Amino acid sequence: GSSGSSGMSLKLQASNVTNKNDPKSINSRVFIGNLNTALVKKSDVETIFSKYGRVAGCSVHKGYAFVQYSNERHARAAVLGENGRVLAGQTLDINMAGEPKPDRSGPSSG
Questions:
Q1: What stretches of the chain show up as alpha helix (H) in DSSP?
Q2: How far apart are CA 51 and CA 58, in angstroms?
Q3: CB neighbours of 101 closer than 8 A, spacing ≥ 6?
């Protein structure tokens, strides 16, 4: 039997210049979008994702909802696990928490 390399590469990137973001609770977090947030509650969505693992903190907003986990895996699981699901007719758009800024710039460092 033989086995090749599959998982190994792990780059972070994007680490410089100040910003107006909170890196707190960014380790393991999920951003639930396209959420009607009209019928779906936090207590519910909680038991929905809770499956992936107890959420450190969840927050339901009008239009979207957030979910925090202890491990980075408990998130990804809930990320893909949920990401793609439909609710109310719309496909719950979920993704990992951690987005850059909508803007580009030259090589400013040196």
A1: 42-49, 73-82
A2: 13
A3: 19
Residues in the chain: 110
Q: Give the technique used to solve this structure.
A: NMR
Number of structural domains (the chain) is 1
Distances (CA, A) of 86 to 42, 79, 89: 17, 13, 6
Q: Which residue has the tokens 């450190």?
A: 56
Please list, in sequence order, all residues whose beta carbon lies within 8 angstroms of the beta carbon of residue 51, skipping any fewer than 6 positions away: 78, 81
CATH number at residue 37: 3.30.70.330
Burial (0-12, 13-18, 19+ Cβ within 10 Å), 57: exposed
Q: Is residue 10 part of a domain?
A: no
Nearest to 35 by CA among 94, 79, 96, 97: 94
Q: 36 lies in which domain range?
A: 18-107
